[PDB]
């Protein structure tokens, strides 16, 4: 009569454990490299009812795993092409005055240097055009010369974002919530599990999310401790706001041989007019989008508070300005026009003066760098604005008329907007159940 | 009547059903512990090896563990060992058909090593008795 124990194998059990995931890409490049195993186009998602699960946003190891993973890919892709050691020679530079707009006066600097040719016993005089943010007076030298010299982006391996699928190994499962009211952390009564996550674009930005996955129904303000101004506030929109970015210059590329089987590509001679790069966003759409953000944001703060917006709080160019990698050419853009408004309780575009910096310093690891060769002709961009990464200003008195500014810029936050749903769990098949068992003794 | 509580509820599907109804779904759970990486440089080379070895090692630890207990080769097996009733003073109907398995393991997780500490002793004791009858 007294109950005994029984051994149960495979019964569903979950334990919070995190390990190394795996990559899968859809049918050379820098992300996939045709190395990740292809994922079958039947992402069988299964809904688990009568269950609730806990999700810890900002503590998920998937965010950390992806951050370290792509950096390894970046280093892997940069090794096999020419280094730019011999480009640190003295630069005798001059201004550009041929059909120059007043807004960009002195930006480009026509330069000449005695960089060596393929033969070790011969030199050559080569002239190239460099942006003001790539040279420094000593007459000029490259910005990165006193720092470790960097390679040149292998011309062929484009950095165009490609969706990447993350799949856990056998014996592990990935759970994703589905409630449309999901906060940063808390139980979700619509838990589901899938072996592989949807396409995640690793596209980069610092202020405005580009080509992100939009929210389901309403704008969501996902944030941990909110009364603390020291941590960023992540906002995800619900309807995309189209953004246009273009480079008006008709640039041309010149190939210069540096050594045996090692070539370097320079800029110029430019053709046509000299116009500043600019990005465009609809005025009507942005005002509506901001109005919706404050409406939801006002549910977490005082209703009578006068919400204000302002540009960044200054600092280095890397974090002070919006960044993206459209068309393989980097843009640093001043977004003071997208936050110049005030909201009280109860024409088709914006001109954003952009900037370009061919010499690129990647993640704040200071020992690395890379070169971005130019691309012939004009470059056009069409992307979607899906959210913002704002920061809370301190010194507020009595919590009235609160304001936020764009900031942050850490690459982890960008993926957090895509990996907040997904968490990794471990399967504990073994188990013991009490019942009335009598083993058949031999 | 094609809809019966069975495998097609999905891998981990029984986690939302009662413990009694989850017994028939224990075969869909053992199948998804090895496969999934059948089809196939440092990055993703060592990672694939590390993941594959860990998955193989994890499954083996359970197979070995069931081997010592003598329940290996039987998905649902039980020994003759009794258990201290103080762990859970509940009836069979009060365990299987009225509560999910997920929260059950949490309550008894304290005595997982203790309950394991009786299974192998009995199995070896059973073998010794068989040895006595054998001799």
């Amino acid at each position, epitope marked *: 009569e007294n109950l005994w124990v029984t051994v149960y194998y495979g019964v569903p059990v979950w334990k919070d454990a995190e390990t190394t995931l795996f990559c899968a890409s859809d049918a050379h490049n820098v992300w996939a490299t045709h190395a990740c195993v292809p994922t079958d186009p039947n992402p069988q998602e*299964i809904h688990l009812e009568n269950v609730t699960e806990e999700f810890n946003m900002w503590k998920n190891n998937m965010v950390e795993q992806m951050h370290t993973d792509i950096i390894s890919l970046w280093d892997q892709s940069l090794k096999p092409c020419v280094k730019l050691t011999p480009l640190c020679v003295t630069l005798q530079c001059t201004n550009v005055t041929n059909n120059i707009t007043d807004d960009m006066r002195g930006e480009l600097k026509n330069c000449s240097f005695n960089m060596t040719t393929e033969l070790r016993d011969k030199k050559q005089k080569v002239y190239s055009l460099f942006y003001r943010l790539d040279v420094v007076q000593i007459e000029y030298r490259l910005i990165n010369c006193n720092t470790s010299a960097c390679t040149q982006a292998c011309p062929k391996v484009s950095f165009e974002p490609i969706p990447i699928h993350y799949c856990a190994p056998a014996g592990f499962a990935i759970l994703k919530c*589905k409630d449309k009211k999901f906060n940063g952390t808390g139980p979700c009564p619509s838990v*589901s599990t899938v072996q592989c996550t949807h396409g995640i674009k690793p596209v980069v930005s610092t202020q405005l999310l580009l080509n992100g996955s939009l929210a389901e129904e309403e704008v969501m303000i996902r944030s941990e401790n909110i009364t603390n101004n020291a941590k960023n506030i992540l906002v995800q929109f619900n309807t995309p706001v189209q953004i246009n970015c273009t480079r008006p210059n008709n640039n041309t590329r010149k190939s210069i041989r540096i050594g045996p089987g090692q070539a370097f590509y320079a800029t110029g001679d430019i053709i046509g007019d000299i116009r500043q790069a600019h990005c465009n966003v609809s005025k009507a759409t942005w005002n509506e989008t901001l109005g919706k953000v404050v409406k939801q944001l006002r549910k977490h703060f005082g209703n009578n508070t006068i919400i204000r917006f302002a540009n960044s709080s200054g600092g280095d160019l890397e974090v002070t300005t919006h960044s993206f990698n459209c068309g393989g050419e980097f843009f640093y853009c001043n977004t003071s026009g997208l936050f110049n408004s005030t909201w009280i309780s109860n024409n088709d575009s914006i001109t954003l003066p952009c900037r370009i910096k061919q010499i690129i310093n990647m993640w704040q690891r200071i020992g690395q760098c890379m070169y971005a060769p130019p691309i012939q002709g004009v470059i056009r961009c069409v992307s979607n604005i899906t959210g913002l990464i704002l920061t809370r200003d301190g010194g507020s008195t009595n919590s009235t008329t609160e304001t936020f500014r764009p900031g942050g810029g850490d690459m982890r936050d960008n993926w957090r907007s895509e990996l907040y749903k997904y968490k990794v769990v471990k399967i504990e098949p073994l188990g013991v159940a009490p019942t009335r068992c009598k083993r058949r003794v031999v | 009547a094609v809809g019966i509580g069975a495998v097609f509820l999905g891998f981990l599907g029984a986690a939302g059903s009662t413990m009694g109804a989850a017994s028939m779904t224990l075969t869909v759970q053992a199948r998804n512990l090895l496969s999934g990486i059948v089809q196939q440089l440092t990055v993703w080379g060592i990672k694939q090896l590390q993941a594959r070895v860990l998955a193989v090692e994890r499954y083996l630890r359970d197979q070995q563990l069931l081997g010592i207990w003598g329940c290996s080769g039987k998905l649902i097996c039980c020994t003759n060992v009794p258990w201290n009733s103080s762990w859970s003073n509940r009836n069979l109907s009060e365990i299987w058909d009225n509560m999910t398995w997920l929260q059950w393991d949490k309550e008894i997780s304290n005595y997982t090593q203790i309950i394991y500490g009786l299974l192998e002793e009995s199995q070896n004791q059973q073998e010794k008795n068989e040895q006595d009858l054998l001799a």
Partner: nanobody
Amino acid sequence: QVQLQQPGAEFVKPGASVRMSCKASGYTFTSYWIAWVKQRPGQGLEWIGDIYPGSGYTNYNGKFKNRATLTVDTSSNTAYMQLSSLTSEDSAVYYCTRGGTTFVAEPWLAYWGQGTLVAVS
């Protein structure tokens, strides 16, 4: 009310494909079974297939040799069916009917919709 919205009618061409949708509203779509039924005017009702808007498990009729691919969406509460590439004699109306729970399964064929006229020509 438990309703299964269906498209009115689709006119397709030989060698083409169709996206036979079936909207779910007024109930929980993650539990009830979903099955398709043929209503040829000159012939009796025929069993087409069954999809579980759950685990994603799919079952197909013996006479179909897996000619169709069944897909569901738990986010938008919708169900989809591929033919795939049917022919002229199979031009009739298909009904997306809601089934019972995987456990009880007694309320099968509880509710229907209006169907969609598939006329490949």
